[PDB]
Amino acid sequence: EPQVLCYLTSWSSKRPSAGRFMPENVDPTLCTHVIYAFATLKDHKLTEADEKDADMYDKVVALREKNPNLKILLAIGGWAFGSTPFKELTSNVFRMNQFVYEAIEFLRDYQFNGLDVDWLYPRGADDRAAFVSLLKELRLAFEGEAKTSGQPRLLLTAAVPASFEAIAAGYDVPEISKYLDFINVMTYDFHGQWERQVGHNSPLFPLESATSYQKKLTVDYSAREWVRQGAPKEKLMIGMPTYGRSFTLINDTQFDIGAPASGGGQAGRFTNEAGFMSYYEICEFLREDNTTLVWDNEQMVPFAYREDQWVGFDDERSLKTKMAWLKEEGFGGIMVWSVDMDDFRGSCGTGKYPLITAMKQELSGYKVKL
Template sequence: MRYWQEKGTPPRLLTSAAVSAAKGTVDAGYEIAEISKYLDFINVMTYDFHGSWESVTGHHSPLCKGSNDTGDHVYLNTDFAMRYWQEKGTPVEKLNMGFATYGRTFRLSTESSQVGAPTSGPAAAGVFTKEAGFWSYYELCTFLRGASVRLIEEQKVPYATKENEWVGYDNQESFETKVHYLKCNRFGGAFVWALDLDDFNGQFFLICFYLPSPPTSHTFSNQSTLCTCNDQLHSRPHPRPTITTSSRIPDNSFCATKADGIYVKLDAPGSFYSCANGITWILHCPDNLVFRESCKCCDWP
């Protein structure tokens, strides 16, 4: 990464990495401050914290720590992972948070069904993905018909049960909460794992959204206002550090009043503006291409 960054041979390509969210792996495997110098953005895989490899139920992508988490389990949540990468030296605007379009499943072994309930392995494999302990969104949303849905209030994510099957997943409300959290903390953005696990053909849309919702014992009201988890030592979001990269224009004025997105740069046909959280970036098309407003893309002149 350092070689290609320093070589500077055009066209300059973006470099990124998908990295672990597990503290033990992070400590053993990454020189965070060093790699952050050479990566344009870092995707923190904030999912698969829990799964059927464990003997009790647990949500695989909780936003916050659970009240019953002890030992190393206190690190198994999105909030800790994102802050840990930041505190170890990653500029906050380079950090992207992972959104999972799938659920992790368990087979309950007793009448208990709350978080931490005993299990005997994974629920049945999905009809399409055929992997025990894992359901794509279009598989789990079908399961929700007739299921009991509950909110894990302290972790800001839902789970559902039906008979002896248990699945932790994200829905529209928990995604909205996570989006507000990342914007409030000024992280760079989010990424999805993975598009092919979402309802990409719209085949299950009626089942998931237009039929009556399954019964739920809790509500998500006011969850979308979350900026920090209740038990976090940090009392406020960290301020965005000054960005020194040359791709940011000096006065930062163009995007100050613009919505996030990309815009034509009238005085430079081969370049364009990228606006994110009010910050202005100038990006460049590959050699011989120009930016077209009509498609928001680089194209042949």
């Protein structure tokens, strides 16, 4: 029963032209869960991050109206949110607990199936405990709300980093595994525009060339590191990106892995952030005159370059290769960032939703067992 958790970004509705994505562009039979990103905290209380995000929460739910087994979650936090609103939330108990109690109310008001807690990232010994405390009080209050109210319990999931260094620094893995329904490993952003050398967003395996250090910055090593630190395989949802990480090359003749980069690459027309492109933006890039598509047979992922623009991404083949690895490793399913950056319109010339469809196909008939 492999689970497929799909993140829906709220800000995708603000995209121009075709890029614009709304909750009813979602194929309600694709994913097993849809997670809406993100909400915020208004004085340590879970709330809408924008005034008529509200009607969107209502639109993203009632995807259930056409798939009643579909679970809809609300996400809190994310990258831009930072760590500060979480240290505050968890600095004292009345604050944290009244957040829990009121979040349930909030969640039930909108008829969300659960909460995805995305604190990026706890660091150090007291952040470690605050994170476990937060997860414990929420999970326990959820359990205890189900038997006072008599409804199916609210779900508790959390997104977690890939880096082994990040795991040690902020994550008591046996403890959070205990309270989380689902552990969403963000096995992407291994390399990107913060770096001055070309590297791939999401390599499954490393180059044989690689330093022992970077042999660790792979989907395979990361997911396994989590298993090593206590994580139950059936709760491990391995992250799958539908975007690629792009670079501007210092020199056009140097396009290989490790090639010097001045920084991020040209923003896509619709996502408007230099450093990455959606998959439908990748497709246009591929269609352009003399773009060179390269398959990395060691890393099992593709990248492509034209002139001084270089992008490493996931396609149908690499994602299926990862599904074969995941079934072989016995993981409980996948997490997708994000449903709105897959080619949902089918403009790439393949099917509609070609990336998530590919992963679905390869997961068919897979039962996770122990």
